[PDB]
Amino acid sequence: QVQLQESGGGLVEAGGSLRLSCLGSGLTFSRYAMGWFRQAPGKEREFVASITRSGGSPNYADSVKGRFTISRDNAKNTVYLQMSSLKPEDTAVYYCAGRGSVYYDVWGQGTQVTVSS
Amino acid sequence: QVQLQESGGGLVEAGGSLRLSCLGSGLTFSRYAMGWFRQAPGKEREFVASITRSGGSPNYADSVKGRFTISRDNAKNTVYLQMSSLKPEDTAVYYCAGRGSVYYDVWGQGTQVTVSS
Amino acid sequence: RMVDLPVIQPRLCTHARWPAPVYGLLVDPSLPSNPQWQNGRVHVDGTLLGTTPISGSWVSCFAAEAAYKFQSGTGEVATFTLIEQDGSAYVPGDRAAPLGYPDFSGQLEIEVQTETTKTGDKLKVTTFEMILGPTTNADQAPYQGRVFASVTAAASLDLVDGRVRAVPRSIYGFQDTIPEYNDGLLVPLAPPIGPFLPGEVLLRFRTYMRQIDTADAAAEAIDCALPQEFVSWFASNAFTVQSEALLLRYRNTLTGQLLFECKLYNEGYIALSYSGSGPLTFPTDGIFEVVSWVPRLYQLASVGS
Amino acid sequence: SIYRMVDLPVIQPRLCTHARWPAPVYGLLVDPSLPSNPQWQNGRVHVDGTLLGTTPISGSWVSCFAAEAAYKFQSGTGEVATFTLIEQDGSAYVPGDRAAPLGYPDFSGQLEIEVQTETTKTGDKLKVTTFEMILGPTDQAPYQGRVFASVTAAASLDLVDGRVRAVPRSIYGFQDTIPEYNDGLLVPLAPPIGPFLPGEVLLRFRTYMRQIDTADAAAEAIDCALPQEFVSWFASNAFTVQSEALLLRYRNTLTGQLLFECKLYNEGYIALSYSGSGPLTFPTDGIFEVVSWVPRLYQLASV
Ligand SMILES: C[C@H](CCC(=O)NCC(=O)O)[C@H]1CC[C@H]2[C@@H]3[C@H](O)C[C@@H]4C[C@H](O)CC[C@]4(C)[C@H]3CC[C@]12C
Ligand SMILES: C[C@H](CCC(=O)NCC(=O)O)[C@H]1CC[C@H]2[C@@H]3[C@H](O)C[C@@H]4C[C@H](O)CC[C@]4(C)[C@H]3CC[C@]12C
Ligand SMILES: [Mg+2]
């Protein structure tokens, strides 16, 4: 079974930071472009960040530009989201996703981030 | 300097046989599908026989089916045309041609076959 | 080095006989077993067979010098002097037609860029009716590099003769049978697909063609032996032939499920062992992977349903 | 290096598929008078094989879409098609890390499109209908999965709502500028092509689009950074990245003549060193060969 498992969420003050990680198992990790998505309660699942197979051409939702950094370590089968300068609007379930080819077709179960105001 | 050089033509009796050969130099011979063409005096250049890079699915002009056999030996960079049961209609210049891709784009100088009746 | 296939799902592939996505993957023993398809024909060694082109953009298309004339009681008539689609001279040879020429029958609506001397759109796209044949009065000779099309018109369109690329708009009266290549005479062809061991049937990559139909709204299917991506992949790789067939698996990458195994014969067609009488369709989201070289008589595990 | 070296498919440009309009590649050139850093969203691939922007795998997806179509007759316009977009294989389109559904046009003007339409008119069950679709450069919202097209008509065409594949018949008023993806708002984009060293210019793979023009004029050029065959080659191969660029040689195979060397940068564009004023075209019958990984600052021989 191809699987992704997020960790690192929790409760954090506005202006604060945390780093999510996502571990791939049962796949050739370096063949998957990765992304982070989130679902804020009451809202649609939205794009946060994308990176290529080799860790190139990071791209970001406009709402997180400059504040969030996506990176990966293929030797550890892991992708990271550094979340800084956190705001209340960042409160969401954060999901890790892999794109073997054209679609994000494998998903982590998600980790909660609560920014207190 | 990708090059093909035929040999083996000449003068032969009707009902007789001969074998043309064609040597490829300055190319990766196993990457070229090969063909034999002929031009009878006063006629257009016409298809005689074809064979795939690896020596598969031989194909023949209707007029030579059963009498002519195309083969190759990639270890020797050579393609052969066994011409048997020759008829006057077989009198022509015979050319070998190489198709690296979609087109016969490398050609031998040609060799004369004259069938005497 | 071992044969490998591209890591691409069938639903993301290009059809090899009509310029559309692959929508379907199936076997159907009720269909003709040994089709004479001239496009989508490649040897595993990467030799292109029949009229097969490299680019999907060439499939069921042509290129020509167009000469136009008006004729009372027909309309505007196009006489197309065919050229290969890259503009390199078409010479009658070891195949039926210019690379990519349609290998099916019916009445094909084609689109070309036209130029008129008239007012309004000087440059526009004109639809022409082309009868693929065989038909008693088709008089199509794509083998000889000559084909004809027309469009009803009350008066001359005053078109300028020149270069065209013709693409397929729609098919009326589609039949999966080779067109009229040489005005009735024989031409060189890729052989019928096959042979098959007992219990083996053709694997079909299916798309659906834009059609004209006065009465029936059912999609019109056309099958090919391999997606165009497999043609370009074998063309470029020049793999070594080590037996008569490759044993493939069709695997879902995410679950690891093995949907079936099959034989890609050297001559470029895939067989499954299937005993049903009716269609069996497959998910289009697995991946074909090479397991090994196997001989002609290698016996596949039968696929269920 | 324990790693497999990058290679390219052994295919002449003239036998390749264009990545931004569904046609053959007819041209290969540099032209420093054109926009040097285009925002093309199709034909965008990382050498690592990650597809960028809206780039599809198949050439059959390029400048096409798929939708649930809703038809109506609208006073002031004619027959209107409201297209609720879906990915071209039928999987759900969800606004995400890109501008639009895979393969959606990445240029502007008025696109003539063709769809299969069922009618309720007796004797006319299935036909093909042409519609005009304003891509931009300015309400289409392909990012949201909603676009509209129209045909001038005296009355209802009696069309049945259903699933469509839309393919491009022609372009009117072509502009090589990204369309209105989101009603004026920003969307995620593949970044502009570049950067370039001093003296470096983008290698263009060129095709020509079926057009409508009242003024006659010449073929309408559209360029892409890589042919579709190079996109699917990197996507399948997942090569390891060992530096910032690959030095390529473009060589005639029959004669062995080296025509030029160039750099394929990791973000999927090729640069040549060229300082002439006008365009310079190249023969389309050579082959690109990978020589080596080179640094960003590698200096190419001029052409
Ligand atoms: C006026 C048209 C361009 C419009 C068009 O039909 N575009 C094709 C599309 O949109 O698919 C011209 C521009 C380039 C031309 C082609 C190229 O010059 C290459 C080739 C040259 C041959 O003499 C004739 C055929 C052929 C293949 C030409 C057909 C007509 C083309 C395609
Ligand atoms: C009636 C048409 C077939 C005719 C047609 O337009 N052919 C395409 C071509 O000739 O290029 C049907 C048959 C299969 C259909 C497609 C498939 O069902 C897959 C997919 C399903 C989605 O719900 C809608 C879009 C999409 C992509 C469908 C669009 C309309 C298609 C293409
Ligand atoms: Mg029908």
Side-chain angles (χ1 to χ4, degrees):
Chain A
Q1 66 291 321
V2 172
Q3 198 183 355
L4 299 171
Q5 297 177 280
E6 298 99 336
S7 29
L11 174 55
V12 63
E13 73 278 351
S17 66
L18 51 82
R19 187 178 313 127
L20 310 180
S21 75
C22 169
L23 177 68
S25 57
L27 58 66
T28 329
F29 196 69
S30 58
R31 286 194 67 93
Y32 292 72
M34 302 296 302
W36 290 97
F37 296 78
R38 64 185 183 187
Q39 186 161 20
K43 269 166 78 169
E44 230 70 88
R45 196 171 60 195
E46 64 185 31
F47 174 57
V48 175
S50 64
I51 197 172
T52 80
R53 286 168 171 177
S54 77
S57 312
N59 202 18
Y60 299 96
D62 220 78
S63 62
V64 311
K65 272 201 212 290
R67 313 191 281 121
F68 291 19
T69 309
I70 186 171
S71 68
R72 67 193 297 164
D73 186 347
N74 282 345
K76 291 189 172 188
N77 298 311
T78 300
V79 57
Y80 306 98
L81 192 66
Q82 174 69 58
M83 301 175 63
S84 302
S85 308
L86 283 166
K87 295 172 208 222
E89 92 198 32
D90 294 326
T91 292
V93 181
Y94 285 72
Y95 309 88
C96 188
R99 176 158 55 105
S101 203
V102 305
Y103 303 134
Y104 291 103
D105 49 4
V106 51
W107 291 86
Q109 285 288 120
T111 184
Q112 305 148 62
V113 177
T114 307
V115 182
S116 63
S117 199
Chain B
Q1 58 158 342
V2 170
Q3 194 187 337
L4 296 174
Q5 311 148 262
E6 299 90 348
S7 53
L11 174 61
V12 52
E13 70 282 355
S17 73
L18 61 82
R19 186 178 313 127
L20 306 183
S21 81
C22 175
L23 180 75
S25 60
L27 47 47
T28 330
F29 188 77
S30 71
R31 297 190 69 87
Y32 290 79
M34 299 299 296
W36 286 93
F37 293 81
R38 75 188 177 182
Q39 182 166 194
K43 288 191 56 167
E44 234 82 77
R45 189 174 68 197
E46 73 201 3
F47 170 57
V48 174
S50 64
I51 197 171
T52 71
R53 291 162 173 186
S54 69
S57 75
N59 199 30
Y60 300 101
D62 184 71
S63 57
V64 309
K65 268 155 200 333
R67 309 193 284 120
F68 288 25
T69 311
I70 187 166
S71 64
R72 68 192 293 159
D73 184 354
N74 282 351
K76 290 192 194 204
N77 280 21
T78 299
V79 63
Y80 305 102
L81 191 67
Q82 176 71 61
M83 294 167 71
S84 298
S85 309
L86 287 165
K87 307 169 176 192
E89 85 195 44
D90 298 324
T91 290
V93 179
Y94 284 74
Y95 309 90
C96 55
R99 176 165 52 113
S101 201
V102 289
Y103 304 133
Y104 291 105
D105 60 0
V106 50
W107 290 87
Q109 77 279 3
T111 185
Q112 300 154 50
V113 175
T114 309
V115 185
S116 70
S117 174
Chain C
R1 100 192 161 286
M2 199 25 191
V3 178
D4 66 21
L5 284 174
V7 186
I8 181 180
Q9 306 179 2
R11 64 199 293 144
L12 302 187
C13 290
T14 315
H15 205 267
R17 284 230 295 139
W18 184 271
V22 174
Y23 293 121
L25 182 70
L26 83 165
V27 291
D28 191 349
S30 75
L31 297 176
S33 294
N34 312 88
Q36 286 190 279
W37 299 335
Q38 300 299 306
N39 297 316
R41 301 296 298 277
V42 71
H43 196 285
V44 296
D45 73 19
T47 303
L48 299 170
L49 304 171
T51 54
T52 305
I54 286 291
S55 171
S57 78
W58 290 38
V59 164
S60 188
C61 297
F62 68 84
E65 284 298 332
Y68 301 107
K69 71 189 163 195
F70 182 75
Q71 94 165 30
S72 293
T74 310
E76 195 79 7
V77 175
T79 309
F80 297 122
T81 305
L82 299 178
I83 189 140
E84 300 284 4
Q85 286 186 71
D86 69 321
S88 83
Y90 171 63
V91 178
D94 75 336
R95 54 179 149 89
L99 294 181
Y101 193 88
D103 68 346
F104 51 81
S105 312
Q107 183 173 330
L108 183 69
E109 281 192 307
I110 61 177
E111 274 162 356
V112 303
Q113 179 90 82
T114 60
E115 184 197 357
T116 188
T117 51
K118 282 178 152 23
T119 76
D121 302 326
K122 293 284 188 187
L123 281 186
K124 85 191 66 157
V125 173
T126 302
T127 307
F128 289 91
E129 309 295 314
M130 189 188 175
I131 297 178
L132 291 176
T135 277
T136 60
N137 307 128
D139 322 320
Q140 302 297 29
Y143 174 73
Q144 297 297 348
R146 275 175 294 106
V147 299
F148 306 88
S150 61
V151 54
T152 58
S156 171
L157 298 177
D158 294 341
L159 301 192
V160 179
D161 299 353
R163 304 161 151 166
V164 301
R165 159 163 161 86
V167 302
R169 172 185 177 83
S170 70
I171 187 64
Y172 175 69
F174 170 80
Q175 256 184 322
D176 195 18
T177 188
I178 52 145
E180 177 163 351
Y181 280 122
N182 189 23
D183 209 11
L185 304 178
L186 195 92
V187 305
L189 294 166
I193 280 161
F196 297 93
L197 302 189
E200 283 183 349
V201 294
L202 184 54
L203 187 62
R204 299 163 183 275
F205 300 82
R206 180 159 285 188
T207 194
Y208 299 104
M209 299 166 285
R210 278 184 303 284
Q211 62 178 318
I212 300 175
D213 194 311
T214 59
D216 177 18
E220 201 71 21
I222 183 174
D223 297 327
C224 64
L226 297 182
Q228 187 68 26
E229 284 77 7
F230 287 25
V231 176
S232 52
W233 187 260
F234 294 146
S236 178
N237 277 283
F239 294 124
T240 279
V241 179
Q242 292 185 232
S243 186
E244 288 86 70
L246 288 156
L247 177 63
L248 310 181
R249 282 166 188 163
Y250 189 60
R251 231 180 41 77
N252 182 291
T253 308
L254 289 189
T255 62
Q257 199 202 347
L258 206 153
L259 307 195
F260 60 78
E261 71 166 13
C262 58
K263 287 158 74 180
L264 169 62
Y265 285 99
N266 292 349
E267 299 71 25
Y269 63 90
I270 300 167
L272 274 74
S273 174
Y274 172 72
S275 54
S277 79
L280 180 66
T281 69
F282 304 104
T284 53
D285 67 334
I287 302 286
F288 287 98
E289 50 208 39
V290 174
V291 177
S292 61
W293 286 103
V294 298
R296 181 185 65 83
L297 288 170
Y298 194 84
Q299 182 62 53
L300 289 165
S302 247
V303 60
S305 271
Chain D
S1 183
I2 57 162
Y3 292 122
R4 169 140 200 267
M5 189 53 180
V6 177
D7 54 42
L8 292 176
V10 182
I11 308 179
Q12 291 176 17
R14 66 194 301 144
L15 304 182
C16 289
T17 312
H18 197 271
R20 291 181 66 230
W21 184 266
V25 173
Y26 298 118
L28 185 67
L29 84 158
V30 292
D31 184 348
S33 66
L34 292 179
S36 66
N37 311 86
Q39 298 185 270
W40 302 336
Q41 296 301 304
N42 296 321
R44 304 296 301 279
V45 70
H46 194 281
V47 292
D48 74 18
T50 302
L51 300 173
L52 304 174
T54 52
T55 301
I57 280 284
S58 170
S60 73
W61 291 36
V62 171
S63 187
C64 300
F65 66 90
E68 174 57 46
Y71 304 105
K72 78 192 160 160
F73 187 75
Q74 175 166 293
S75 151
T77 301
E79 191 74 20
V80 169
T82 304
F83 293 127
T84 306
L85 295 180
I86 192 145
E87 296 287 5
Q88 290 191 68
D89 71 314
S91 44
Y93 172 67
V94 176
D97 73 333
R98 56 178 148 91
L102 298 181
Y104 186 86
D106 66 348
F107 52 84
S108 296
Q110 198 175 310
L111 190 68
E112 203 181 28
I113 59 167
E114 297 170 345
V115 296
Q116 180 95 87
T117 61
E118 188 185 339
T119 322
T120 56
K121 297 180 171 178
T122 204
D124 200 19
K125 177 72 75 175
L126 280 187
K127 69 147 57 136
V128 174
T129 307
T130 300
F131 292 93
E132 306 284 348
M133 183 171 169
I134 312 278
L135 292 172
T138 180
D139 87 285
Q140 307 278 23
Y143 170 75
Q144 306 289 346
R146 193 192 343 108
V147 299
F148 313 101
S150 69
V151 58
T152 300
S156 182
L157 291 193
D158 295 334
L159 307 183
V160 178
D161 298 353
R163 298 167 164 170
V164 299
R165 150 156 166 93
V167 305
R169 189 170 198 266
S170 75
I171 189 65
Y172 173 84
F174 172 71
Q175 275 189 300
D176 189 16
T177 197
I178 57 156
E180 177 164 72
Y181 282 117
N182 193 28
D183 281 311
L185 283 53
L186 286 191
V187 298
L189 296 169
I193 283 168
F196 288 97
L197 302 187
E200 282 181 354
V201 295
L202 179 57
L203 183 64
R204 302 162 181 273
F205 299 82
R206 185 161 285 184
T207 197
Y208 298 99
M209 307 167 280
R210 281 179 301 274
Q211 57 185 321
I212 303 171
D213 204 317
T214 58
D216 196 5
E220 193 73 268
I222 184 171
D223 296 323
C224 67
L226 292 179
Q228 194 64 28
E229 285 84 4
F230 283 26
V231 174
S232 53
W233 189 261
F234 294 139
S236 185
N237 269 291
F239 293 124
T240 296
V241 177
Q242 293 186 52
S243 182
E244 273 68 62
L246 287 166
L247 172 67
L248 307 192
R249 277 166 195 153
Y250 188 65
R251 191 186 294 285
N252 182 286
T253 315
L254 297 178
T255 72
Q257 193 199 358
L258 172 68
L259 301 167
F260 60 82
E261 67 168 23
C262 59
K263 285 152 67 180
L264 168 59
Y265 286 98
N266 290 351
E267 281 229 72
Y269 61 100
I270 298 167
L272 278 69
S273 187
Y274 175 67
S275 72
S277 50
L280 177 63
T281 65
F282 305 103
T284 54
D285 62 353
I287 300 279
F288 286 96
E289 164 205 343
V290 175
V291 181
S292 58
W293 284 106
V294 294
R296 173 183 71 83
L297 281 165
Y298 190 85
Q299 179 60 59
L300 287 165
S302 173
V303 293

